[model samples]
Target: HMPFVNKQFNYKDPVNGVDIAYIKIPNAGQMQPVKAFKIHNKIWVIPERDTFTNPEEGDLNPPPEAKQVPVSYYDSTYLSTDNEKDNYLKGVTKLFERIYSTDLGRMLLTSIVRGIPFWGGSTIDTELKVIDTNSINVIQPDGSYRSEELNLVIIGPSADIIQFECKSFGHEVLNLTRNGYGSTQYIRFSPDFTFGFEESLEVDTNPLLGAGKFATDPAVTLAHELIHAGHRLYGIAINPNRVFKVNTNAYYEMSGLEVSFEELRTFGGHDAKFIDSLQENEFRLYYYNKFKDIASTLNKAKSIVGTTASLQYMKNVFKEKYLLSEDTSGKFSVDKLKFDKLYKMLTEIYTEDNFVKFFKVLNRKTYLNFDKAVFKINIVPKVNYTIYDGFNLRNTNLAANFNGQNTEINNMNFTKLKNFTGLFEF
Candidate 1:
């Protein structure tokens, strides 16, 4: 049976003021009409799979609008079961949706999209793939081979690719003990930025999964990676002519904060090497240093207001004031009474100004200063005779305890002494 059809509707172009009627065709087995237009007495319509665009004057068909940012996936044939494939799709879909929907997530997207000035007009695409851990082989020092577990991001001139190697059947469970769960790398200009993540880390997004309070949320890790991307873009912006170089030796030796300071010094022409390092170390330190009290404060705020309302309020605060700010003028501030309540909930020493300063340092707008006394060492000299159990002792303590207790000892006990005396007498 043919679906009921509606009369053609008159459409007028606002810009050109050209009057035309949309020829509505009733969709088979559906009540709604399929969108179509009449151009030069011929039907012009975009296919369902294709993007849509308004037709121009005397044009038969307008080209579809280009997607500014597209997220694509590489399906793994190793996902043997239909359920496994479904789960993989569900997990990826949830993650992408969360990123596009949230305030901070959108900020990260904006930073990535606008990072490179030259690519401003082109589409920035992201590719995600799940790899079987068994497929990757690594050679051991003993000449044995083992599968390599990988979770990494590869940023290229063409697209940013995120790959995760999982052992589980559905590739849904991420083992935190191995692979560090996530990682990001940014070195060189327009960096080949690659980010890796474990699938299980997405549990934090689902309330039913009962994620631990102390567990580093996937969102936090994403933010950390995006921050690295933004930082690299910022460096390129400042030093357009300088060719950045990565010092792997320095990276292994220095802490993240130390590297950060080194990077600042490098920017000022103190050094030429770029600190090509992961953001995790610095992010962990910063989280403990500043956000340690945030959860408790947030809980308190939630109790006073509502959970959703309080979170929304904080989200708005971050979006409007801090995330994209260039200077300290956009300080982290709230109502005095509300601040007092949240502050009282915290057990550690914290202040709005200090918090603002911490973010300023994170954003690379300011560099941290260390007092010379903090680096100075006070030497203390002392002597002690104490025996400890370990290998490679200066003197043998093995037979000393028995010698003092029950053994009768010769006055001249050394065989070396007898040989020395015979030689001297001769």
Candidate 2:
């Protein structure tokens, strides 16, 4: 019994043309947050990316025609539980690209958006919103910002990250009920809005399980930046791959946001060499445990880092470094880093293997400026295209492991955007 041929699932698109989606922007609105998205077939859920909420189960159905945007995603089961669901999920994970809007949201230490208040500016906003052309803002490109180089330091060895940030997954629609007649839009100074900057941050998850692994491709990172409309906001910083461990005992508590960075650096530090020695030590302890279990975990951390690597090698090493640097307390401390060598390491990491990695924006398109506070922090997506060998749809996945091991196919059929292309340049 062929799945698609059977009567189990409808041949029509599952995306509900009128449902809601969520998206995030660098610096727009009050807090640089995300609103909801309302399209025809998919619904994305972001902290403050979109402008509406998820629709009820029955709200999603086939559309009469192609819609502007959709709010219904596979939802882990938005499609039938059969092969179709699995196929679609794979396709979206690799093909979709997202960029953030200029909404209200704060930039966390890792430089990612920390959703803000909107529903009456209240804390009870579970509804996503959809906005329009007037909502998006473009980033500035004053040559001066990109001209100067900042110190790029490694958090740890090639294994400092325990979690990775992901791209915006949905769209948003503006509803007159919440903020229409006399509502005050959000303003921000953190990064995107104030200047041309991008938001980024690290998160924690059991990497052994690969929670957000779908976003690991770099093509996804590129698409978000390429699709700047300056008309609406969208996109989210990718999460960290694997975070270093932290111990509550060693971490110090901060009562205020105005801590003197100089004082903290001079007086208390987990490692005199690294800015993050305190947590590094804890991660080392965890690393030691893993080393006992897996042979790969026992390899020297420093070898795969900035030292003896260039281009893609460095990216793979850096990805591992981010995972290892999640904590700078114990063994993961990073005190010294050579910029020239490290820079070369990332030289070709952002370049794509396919085309020269050019992007195209449709006409009637407006653009917004990224907040200056952060500047052009690279993202985790790209406009990459993946064609499964033999038209099998699930045979060859270079960014990930769809290596034709099983006959199962999915949306995994193709990828227009991948987060693993490493094709970025700030």
Candidate 3:
């Protein structure tokens, strides 16, 4: 018989008339076979040359294998001292509370939490953690390594984790105190949404000593950064697989399949239309607050004097108050005809209804084009006047002076004034 060397077998032993199993011997060099017998319904294998024996039973129950659970890097606290961490937490808490208190701030938070429906409704985490650093030193052409701050979200693929670091506002304050100027903090969003300097403006920092602009306010900085973060989160939510191209200072999407940064910003909180809307509303608020008493004065003056003369008086008062300060660029003061038109429009249209209409147009996306949107609610009339109007007004005054016939000149001036006023009847 050929030497049987199959590794496993189930057969009956012809001579013994018992069930048998075979196991091939490992590394025997030649054809080696092993014998096996069914003992207690279990097959036990032995060397063919040796007597068959039953093997001991193995333990049925065993411990499970070990597995590693993922740990987030953000879970670790990085601030050196307890006091530092406390300050950091306090700063974050105060900033968030301030943001929640405002209408525009609440709007920004809502978009991040609920997400825009048009962008597939992927919400970003509002929880921000304090991190030690999220910046890398990049080598420059001069063979120097410059520290470049990076977005923490980009470093880690998880969008739900946001990180920030606390920077010293004292440096900025000192610079402003000594040099009379300071820099505004900037929030850059790309690869992912992350911000820096969340705790810089704490009360301990005392930057309020030279707080010239409201931009220096911690709440304003947080709000501004939140706007950028909201836009980046929306971009990622819309297209998670979009590739980013990173440069020394900035990051942008690289693929043609992804939406452009400008397109993403268009519907974002800081778009051109949104910014214009905000500026317009702010200007309107300032005008109303600063000139409400003046408006009341004009109303009384209108009853006493005629409408035209009262309007002229109001114009002179407005020029005296705002010419040097508000209209330094001469946008409203240089052109007398245009200024008159503007004054008329401002006085007539400064109603609550017009303000409401402006905001309604802002909230509606159907008016995609800004011009079309503003056109529907038209709060401010276009101050249209040409250089020729100035020339004609000057010429009319000269003609009256040259005639020197008091009665005839008065008649001519009255007619010219009537004609000039009629030109802007609408």
RMSD of 3: 39.5
Tens digit of lDDT per residue, candidate 2, span 106-169? 0111111111111122122322221222232222233111111111101110110111112121
Off by over 4 Å in 2: 1-78, 91-426
Which structure is stronger by TM-score: 1 or 2? Answer: 1
What TM-score against the true fold does each predicted structure earn?
0.21, 0.19, 0.21
TM-score of 2: 0.19
lDDT of 3 by residue, 276-355 (tens): 34544443444333334332332233222212334444345444432212344322322334433433232222222222
Weakest ten-residue segment in model 1 by summed lDDT: 371-380
Ordered by lDDT, highest first, the candidates read: 3, 1, 2
CA lDDT, candidate 1, residue 300? 30
| Alpha-carbon deviation at 96 in model 1, angstroms | 3.4
Residue pairs whose backbone atoms clash in candidate 3: none
